Design a protein around this nucleic acid. Structure first.
Ligand code: K
Ligand code: K
Ligand code: K
Ligand code: K
Ligand code: K
Ligand code: K
Ligand code: K
Ligand code: K
Ligand code: K
Ligand code: K
Lengths: 184, 184, 184, 184, 184, 184, 184, 184, 184, 184
DNA sequence: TTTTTTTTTTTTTTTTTTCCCTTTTTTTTTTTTTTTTTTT
């Protein structure tokens, strides 16, 4: 089962070499730091899909070790909330990485909205920072300044077009139902 | 049993390929954000059915790791309640994903009603956010902006009609009873 | 034993297909929401019987993980009580679903009566919300607005008549005693 | 699995000899100490990649044993935050090293930003200090004064150029998917 | 695995004889005690390399049982910080030694800097004091007064020169990758 | 492994008879008690080497069960610190001895120095007092008044000279590396 | 190992018969009770050696279950400290005996000295009282008044002379090293 | 081992019949109760020897489950201390008996002396009361009033004379050493 | 061992039939209740011997689950102490019965004496009440009013005479020593 | 052992049929409720004997899960004490039933007596209420109003006469001793 | 509606010298609507 199954030679080598890869502009995005300059990041769903491909839908697993709200302050109608989380990612072989993530909500005037934003942002950031420690392909290269410089030296491509023809349109999945009924 | 049974090759590949799928307009819905614009989401029962199909009624499992009420305030007859929950989803192979969810009740004047709403909303939202991490088919694509743009470029279909002819009308299920009596 | 026995292929497929079923008007009921309109629900005993049929009298199990009284207030002779519970339902294979339920007693003037109502209501509602996550047949469809619209489009039949001819009239059950004495 | 698999003779000897290696100028960087002089360090991603190469993506693992915020002070608009973390690195054979790391944010005026910086910096510093105890190749030589003196006597090379031609550009990894589908 | 593998006769005898050795002037260093005189010590990285050679990179392991900040005082701008740690070193056979170490930062005016210094110094000192109990070769002789007297009677040699020709210059270690791919 | 391996007859008898031995003047030292007279003791490193020889570098193990600072007082610039520790020594066969040790720093004016001294002295004293309970050879005879009287009746020898010719001068131990590479 | 090995018939009978022995004047000593009269005792090292002979260096083991300082008072410069300890002695067969011991320091004016004396005295006294419960040979006869009366009726011998000719004079023990190297 | 070894038929019957025995005047003693009259008891060492004979040095075991000081009062210079203990005696077969014991020190003026007396008296009294529950031979008959009446009807013999000829006079026990060396 | 060994058919039937017995006047005693009348009881040692005979010295076992002092009051020099205990009796087959017992000391003026009486009386009374639940022979009939009425209608015999001829007069029991030495 | 042994078919059927029985007037007794009327009950020893017969002395077991004193009040010399207990009965097969019982002492003026009564009554009542859940034969019928009506319609017989001829008159039970000595 | 007597002696000399220089930059975008009457 999970945590017990050991990696085969082919799977190991494939995952290792694929994890030494770096990401292309189709993954990186850009924000405007406060007082700073253009910073580069990788969106959450991007890292989630990257993990689900590298390891499988059941090859990796994450958990919230602890989430703690640091502070909640109120300045003339604005709610400032700081929240941190500790996400631990674990592979089916037993290997594991754990790291912190933070969430920040300074502008809003609704306490519930600020907390909703902060906690989810903290958990997502922690998941990103914990998946980082597996290899460049999972976000370890986003902190390599030379990698960023070489990313600036690439054509700034337009957003990719998503084809919604073969999108999921009904509940039943006979392809899965068949294999699972035969799985007993 | 659950947590011990390992996925077979056929079941694994089927589930993986089905989880790389994206959802169609028949699942997405729309709300009006306060001050913002049209946002897209997936209703709870939709994700629940998606999971029950992808993995089975006994292929997935969720649990409330911890639920904590953040605050309960009262402003001139209005009860403002913030509540968060931590849902952990686990597959029969042992793989698991855990994420937060929030519930918000600002309008009502009854404390009990506001708390009921906040807690149930928090648990359901946490279940959604935890099932997201399995693949686009289970809600990971709802955060892909390009996917949303391509969703706007599709015919806005009218709500589907539900056929209540073959609906369940009595308690006993002999189809199940037979197999279960023979299961001993 | 319970939690250890694994589902057979026939039982699995039967339960899955039976859980894709939707319920008929013979189960749904109606209330008048405060300030809102006609809402639809499913009575407790209905869901209990549905579960006892889908899985068996010993195929499903529930437990109260935690029940916590949120508040107890007194306004000029009226007791307002809010209570929540956390019910975890588990199948004999180990699969499990856990969700919250709430109980509310605002009108009554007896504290004991209000608490008696609130706690039992919370546990029953939590059991319903936890059994929901197994499939449409167990109450997951009650939240589908299209399903409700199609429910309005059916003849609203009068309450069913209960036949009390073959009702239990004595203690001893020789049918069971025989099998159990031979079960050693 | 992890913590159980034992090192083979070839793997052991290779890792040992590779860990006796010292690092070149392509890894070391430089900062300006307050009141002091040019100090040398190793960037986080550098050590992360070094570990992922020496042991494998699943050959090493780290965890946060405990993180505690030491203090949070406010002096006329400036937030001074001290935070410490305890990282424990473990190899697939069961060997483990644990050490502290610190994070410091004195300048910023936003509490949330200061804490975000401090906690992540503490965890990363702890990971570096814990990976140090495996050999010179993982950062143990950065404290050898003679090694630093000999580093100053080398040509100060220009930042390395990163080749983004073969960078990862899509989600699916058929090389990995193949081996994993055959791994069942 | 670690904690389970037993020492062979050859490894045992080799380690024993190597641990009865005493160290040469190439390892000892000197400080100026406050109010006292020239004291002799062994730098941290030295002991780390000594252990990684005597036992192997995966033959020994250490852990922080507990670290507690004793005091934090402030005298007219000067921060005096005392911190202690408890390090437990363990060999792959199960043998273990645990001892305290202290860290001291009296001069600095920044609280964060003083704590950063104190905690890391405490952990390193504890690791040294815990490795002392294995033999003279690992630092047990630094307290032998006759050994120090004989050290003074040796030529005070100039710092050794470090050769950075064959130093590690890239991430990949094919020597290790080969054996690890063959380790399956 | 450690705690599991049982002593053989030869090892048992050898250790027993060697532990019935008493120590010579080459180990005993002398201090000046406050108000008292010449007291005799055995230095820490001496007992450490004695244990590492009697049992082996991996035949004995010690641990700090608990260390608690009794008091920290300040009298006109002088810091008086009392600290106690509880050390438990255990042999590879499972036998164990646990005893207290104390550390005292009355003179110093720096709190950090006094605490460092008290804690380290307490742990070392506890290790000595715990190793005492194995036999006269490990310090049990230092409390025999007749043994001390007979020690006074011996020639007061001059400090031994330490030969630093064959002292350890490099890191690598090919004698050990060979056996360890063959240990797989 | 310890706690598992069972006593053989020969070992059992030998230890049993040897424990019925009573001690001679070469072991008993004398003190002057305050206000009372001459009391007789057995020194600590005596009992320790007696145990190490009766059972072996690895046949008995003791541990400090709990030590609690009862009081610390100060009367015009004199420190009165009471301390108790609970020592549990256990044989390799699993048999165990636990008893209390007390330590008292009333005269001294240094708190650290009083505590140092009290705690060690308490633990040693507890070890004596716990070893008492094995037989007269280990100190159970010191409370037999008739035995004391018969002890007074013996020639008051002069202190025994300790022969320091064959005393241990160097670290290495080739006799033990031989058996231990052959123990693999 | 202890707690596992089961009693043989011969040993069982022998112990039972020996435990049905009653004690003679050579064991009973007499005190003067405060305000009462002559009371009869069995001295501690007597019961200890009785147990060590009935079961063996390794056939029985006792432990202090908990000791709690009830009160410590001071009336015009006199210290009144009450202390209770809970002793649990256990045989190698697993049988166990647990009972309370009390210690009392009212006269002394030193707190440390009173506590020293009270705690040891409590533990010893608890050991007596716990060994009582094994049979009349171990002190269960001391509470039979008819037994006391018959004890008064016996010749009050003078204290027995103890023969100190064959008393233990040296440390080494070759009879035991032989069997233990052959026990491997 | 104890708690594991199962009862044989013959032993079971014998114990059962012997436990249906009622007790004769040779066991019952009488007190004068305060304000009440002649009450009947069974002394402690009687029940202890009864249990040691019915089950064996190692066939039954008791333990103090909890003892708690309810109150300690002082009225003009008189100490009124109430104490309760929870005794659990267990047979070697695993069967167990647990019941409370109380101790009362109202008259005495010494706190220590009152507490000693209350606690020991509470534990003994609890042992009696816990052994009651095994059968009439062990004290269950003392509460049958008809049994008491029939007890009054019997000749009240004078206390039995105890024969101290064959009483135990020395420590050694060769009958037991033989079987125990042969038990290896 | 207890809790593990499974019931045979014959034993099961016999116990079941015997548990369907109702009790006769020889067991029921009567009280006079305060303000109410004649109430019917079953004395403690009655239920104890019923259980010891139905299942055996080692077929059932009871335990006090928790006992808590509800209140102790004092009104002009009268002590009003309420106490509750929770008794859990368990059969050798593992089946168990747990229920509450109450004890009440309102009249008495002695606190210790009131508490003794309340606690013992609570435990006994809880044992009765917990044994109720096994069948009518063990007290479940005392709550059947029709059963009470039919009980009033029977001849009120005079108390039965107890024959104390064959009562137990000595300690030793050779009938048991034989089987137990042969049980090894 | 249940539970009502048990107990009171040991216990008392031990230690005591160790431990002192580390450690030096990392990290900044998420996420968005659920829920419905129940009991004696
Ligand atoms: K509701
Ligand atoms: K009642
Ligand atoms: K009583
Ligand atoms: K006493
Ligand atoms: K003493
Ligand atoms: K000292
Ligand atoms: K230091
Ligand atoms: K830093
Ligand atoms: K951020
Ligand atoms: K929301």
């Amino acid at each position: 089962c999970f945590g017990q199954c050991q990696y085969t030679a082919e799977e190991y080598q494939a995952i290792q070499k694929a994890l030494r890869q770096r990401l292309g502009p189709e993954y990186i995005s850009s924000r405007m730091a406060g007082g700073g300059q253009k910073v580069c990041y990788i969106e959450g769903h991007r890292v989630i899909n990257l993990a689900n491909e590298m390891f499988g839908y059941n090859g990796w697993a994450h958990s919230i070790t602890q989430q703690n709200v640091d502070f909640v302050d109120l300045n003339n109608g604005a709610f400032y909330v700081g929240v941190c989380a500790f996400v631990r990612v674990q592979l089916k072989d037993g290997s594991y990485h754990e790291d912190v993530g933070y969430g920040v909500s300074e502008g809003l005037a609704s306490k519930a909205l600020s907390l909703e934003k902060a906690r989810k942002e903290a958990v997502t950031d922690g998941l990103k920072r914990a998946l980082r420690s597996f290899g460049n392909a999972l976000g370890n290269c986003i902190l390599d300044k030379d990698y960023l410089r070489s990313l600036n030296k690439l054509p700034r491509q337009l957003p990719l077009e998503v084809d919604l023809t073969k999108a999921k349109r009904q509940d039943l999945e006979p392809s899965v139902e068949e294999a699972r009924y035969n799985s007993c």
